[PDB]
Design a protein around this ligand. Structure first.
Ligand SMILES: CC(=O)N[C@H]1[C@H](O[C@H]2[C@@H](O)[C@@H](CO)O[C@H](O[C@@H]3[C@H](O)[C@@H](O)[C@H](O)O[C@@H]3CO)[C@@H]2O)O[C@H](CO)[C@H](O)[C@@H]1O
Ligand SMILES: CC(=O)N[C@H]1[C@H](O[C@H]2[C@@H](O)[C@@H](CO)O[C@H](O[C@@H]3[C@H](O)[C@@H](O)[C@H](O)O[C@@H]3CO)[C@@H]2O)O[C@H](CO)[C@H](O)[C@@H]1O
Ligand SMILES: CC(=O)N[C@H]1[C@H](O[C@@H]2[C@@H](O)[C@@H](O)O[C@H](CO)[C@@H]2O)O[C@H](CO)[C@H](O)[C@@H]1O
Ligand SMILES: CC(=O)N[C@H]1[C@H](O[C@@H]2[C@@H](O)[C@@H](O)O[C@H](CO)[C@@H]2O)O[C@H](CO)[C@H](O)[C@@H]1O
Ligand SMILES: [K+]
Ligand SMILES: [K+]
Ligand SMILES: [K+]
Ligand SMILES: [K+]
Ligand SMILES: [K+]
Ligand SMILES: [Mg+2]
Ligand SMILES: [Mg+2]
Ligand SMILES: [Mg+2]
Ligand SMILES: [Mg+2]
Ligand SMILES: [Mg+2]
Lengths: 271, 260, 271, 262, 259
């Protein structure tokens, strides 16, 4: 319900922020497995499914405080920051050339060859908005009991295995909304742009690109970018690269951090 | 229909979801899945049990009440929702190293079949089957005794998608000889261990205007949405496999069109 | 050597035709395995190679009779139908979601899993022309003895395993020109547009798309579409989806029919 | 060459084919194939026999005879790998999908695709570069002898030109990006041995050969130089012996008369 | 740098960087790593020198020329020697090893292809798979980098100032810096992945930023960097080594007036 008016265009009308989101794969920060999940355990049935904390990835999010542009918030019009473009890069793609660190080998029976490296599912998504990303709760198995550390809808019922219009949330906190339990809500997010790709498998080769030359335009079909409510820019992502497999065949998620550059301009809006 | 001028009050937007109809009933523990797939020994004794195969999803959306005016669908967004759930490799899945009782679950793998249709009347179907001798269950809507020509194109074997969750995906497809008033789109990747590849964004708008600049015209002020979204197979520890589906989001923008 | 003159415009100037071509994978029409080849047998050497009839696919073709637009064919100029655009779709893709019909199972040793469905090579091609598709004879093994039912160059010699400028033909008949022995001739086909893709393997997943929204322009670099000599529109195709594998490991080609919509306009030509 | 006005019968089109040179002799039963590939135990005793490895195809096309002089300028091309249809053959003496059961189709052609072509007004300029510098190439092949360890990466001394058909090994020579000012080249490599081959064909694709300055290859000696290599994969026999399989390439080239300073 | 107008005025350079996969130049395995060994745990992880690839880099001296600077406006780049990967006879594990039959498997596995063109050294972010890895003395790394180095730590910076000693697995381009460099990278992982490479002399990449300004060559130096891991070479005894290829650079520069 924001009435959008004129773009401002002077030499001081554009700002740029840069930010990083570290991955939240499960293992705690400042400890030896930071960037990984704990070794994944698998239930015998849907009824007894209770994934332990640290064994599954959660979304990354941050609110970036922008310069406050309005001396008087009672004026007939105010300025808001409008996100018009971004650059985003998955960082540390270089580290995936490591095939020597405690990895199951290509020829395990012969105790020979390189490590198999990271392989399996890729889940890469990011979102840029003027308010938190709007979520739809949806799970593979509704009878999964998520641990206390996680933010989920408890006892969500059978309808949560597909679309249930009751089961909404917002990405309000870093490292607690499980990736497997929440996704972007296309019924909402009028003030956010999101982008995602899933490549499944457990032996799938990761495919990643990185360049500082690619800009994505964030303007909608009315030429309006995300408008930063309360001078807040919301960045969200998940970057599951695949799995790390140990000699003893235990497997963990590996994630990478994401870079964001967002170019914003001053937009007059009705107040 | 004699189509005259675009009117300009004059624009409306609708949003809808279609849940998948993979075979297991709603409001029960396996909703979103088929029942475990059984395989016949030969084409002559081929009776796929009810709940073991996916069916099309469909709905008619009631549009606001209205020479006549008709709602003309000019653009859409669509999205397969719940892609996020496929990051689950812990729920009762055959493991990567089953012989060692070790590794993640293998997750959902195998065939992707993704189709959607938006029109001003029900989707017109062409009946076509892998094996014409398959005996479909009573619950399913099929052409009985369709004959050998139903394994390829037979101009006689027509239908319309009039009901949700009963038209088998494996027996019906969009009819390219009809559907002048519907746009449809479909992608198929086969296999049983194929990596699923799904994308999601809110930045993709598809224009529904034909070559004459005319969108689907909503007969009886009804907008017809149809889809099927098979994501792949769920494999249990005991190697039983079932279809897994996901729900689809629709946004359609419509405008008032004057017609004769 | 047709001298092309003015395009006719106006409400009488365009016609649209729709047609289907059923696949010719080997098994006879109106019998239980229509849409399939017979089970593929494999030779022990190139010298003894003699593929039986029904075991290999052939090209589909039709000549569509167009409205006869000229009352007098002796006039200094006549009208010809000129194909300017087409839509084409592989029909029946829906059927490949069948993994229950007598298929080798994913876990055959456990008698468990879905069927493996249709997997392996995809060969998809179509042509639209004002005359028969012009062909180049070319074979994997020149010593192959084709059955009497098939149209081939007999005793073609070693040069037929690569390009031999002598080994020309035209796609004059339906369901008899083996796919594996004939391909489009890029030296000819001035009045035909053809398009093809091959994806090999026997375990390769089929990849097919279908929509009623995709139009292919058929005008050449001079703005001239295929001109229908004698009011005949030539449609050709092959749509090998992959193989059907039985429980006993016998394998057969599976094909699908193709839809054509062709938009034609009246073109004046010299006569 | 100082380039002046386009003098545009100012236009000519040529068509040609280059048969592959996979190793087995022409006019004999395995034409299009290599001989069955043998693998060495180590880099120090590595001598790939003649016929077991592919070589580049090349031809010079004689064009219509012609202060300043006229030269033919190639402005566009079509090219096509022909015979893609033959790869639907899964019956000709092929290892079977279920060999232990003596059942299934043949496995067909699978493995690496190496597809390159070049169109120039002089021979394609080459850079010598090899997997293993100690490989002993056969007498039939054109190689740099004793090329040194440098030749496993870039060495500026190790140059050649593609002057003859069917004798420059693909695995020892590639296009030189430091040269080829008067040639356009294009290449694609997909590796492996069981990789699915992917090939397309159409007569609706034309490639523009003009450079940044709007000049196409100028045909020195009124000669048009066509080169290629089209490895589609490996043929596997019942006894697991493997051989390269190649396909011929079509070229159409449109040329116009260009005035140049003599 | 305050950038004024585009100012005889154009120059072109060509260069190659040979790969630094680990085995020494002018010896029989130039282009390869040594055979890769694998640790039993993250705690005892000490990759020997020559078993892992490092970045290649060179500074190109530009012609002697408010001030004027050289501004890189376009490049061509190509991975050379793609032709050599058609070799399936040179001491490779056979397709049917049990039968001592078939071609060699050739080069297979991970592709890492990155290049950068700049007016100063490439700015690096340190990031490693396993922070407890002990890199050998020959390598340039951050010693005892801590758990934060397994993801993004803003304290863990370098610049690519030396050829063949910055491990690819420890350094990547820093998106927080590199305002005067253009970098491009693609990774495809796995150990049995088919390599996919293209080559042509018909592709030119524009190096101008959103303000129409290319890399400005500080001290009249042009900085070229790359890593081109094509995949692994597998011997009959299943030992595996990195295989790299050299990269070609063409760069077009123009004279630019700056304050
Ligand atoms: C053991 C197992 O995996 N059970 C799963 C169950 O499979 C059975 C089910 O698919 C039925 C059809 O509804 O078919 C088979 O059971 C038959 C018979 O129908 C049943 O009554 C008897 O118990 O055993 C028979 C042979 O097993 C399948 O085993 O399916 C459910 C979903 O419907 C769950 O997946 C359950 O884990
Ligand atoms: C058995 C078989 O597959 N035969 C095929 C034949 O393979 C031989 C061929 O590749 C030659 C080199 O020209 O090498 C091997 O044969 C050697 C020797 O050269 C030969 O004279 C002797 O009889 O056998 C030896 C091996 O023990 C290969 O077996 O090659 C042709 C193609 O050239 C056919 O593929 C034939 O089926
Ligand atoms: C023996 C081994 O691989 N140990 C792992 C260790 O695995 C643990 C698992 O065996 C079980 O005991 O649960 C705990 C939960 O924290 C561990 O997952 O995990 C650590 C990293 O967490 C490391 O991978 C060891 O090598
Ligand atoms: C037992 C079996 O799988 N039968 C197949 C049948 O195979 C036949 C083959 O075994 C041999 O006898 O030759 C004939 C040639 O016409 C058959 O190929 O084939 C039919 C299909 O025609 C069917 O697949 C049976 O199940
Ligand atoms: K930006
Ligand atoms: K819309
Ligand atoms: K024969
Ligand atoms: K041409
Ligand atoms: K350049
Ligand atoms: Mg909404
Ligand atoms: Mg119609
Ligand atoms: Mg011709
Ligand atoms: Mg040069
Ligand atoms: Mg910066």
């Amino acid at each position: 319900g924001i009435e959008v008016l004129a773009v401002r265009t002077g030499p001081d009308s554009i700002t740029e922020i840069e930010a990083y989101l570290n991955p939240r794969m499960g293992q705690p920060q400042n400890e030896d497995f930071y960037g990984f999940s704990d070794n994944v355990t698998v239930s015998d049935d849907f009824g007894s499914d209770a994934p332990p904390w640290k064994q599954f990835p959660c979304y990354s999010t941050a609110r970036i405080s922008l310069p406050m542009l309005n001396q008087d918030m009672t004026s007939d019009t105010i300025l808001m920051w409008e996100a018009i473009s971004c650059r985003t890069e998955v960082m540390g793609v270089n580290m995936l050339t490591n095939v020597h660190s405690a990895q199951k080998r290509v020829y395990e029976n012969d105790r020979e060859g390189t490590g198999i490296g990271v392989e399996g599912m890729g889940y890469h998504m990011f979102a840029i908005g003027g308010e938190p990303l709007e979520l739809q709760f949806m799970v593979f198995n509704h009878r999964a009991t998520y641990p206390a550390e996680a933010t989920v809808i408890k006892n969500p019922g059978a309808s949560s295995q597909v679309f249930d219009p009751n089961l909404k949330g917002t990405l309000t906190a870093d490292g607690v909304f499980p990736v497997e339990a929440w996704g972007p809500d296309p019924f909402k997010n009028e003030n956010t742009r999101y982008f995602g790709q899933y490549t499944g498998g457990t032996q799938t080769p990761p495919v990643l690109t990185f360049t500082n030359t690619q800009t994505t335009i964030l303007l909608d079909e009315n030429g309006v970018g995300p408008l930063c409510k309360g001078d807040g820019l919301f960045l969200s992502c998940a970057d599951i690269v695949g799995f790390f497999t140990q000699h003893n065949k235990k497997m963990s998620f590996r994630g990478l951090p994401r870079y964001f550059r967002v170019t914003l301009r001053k937009r007059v809006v009705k107040n």
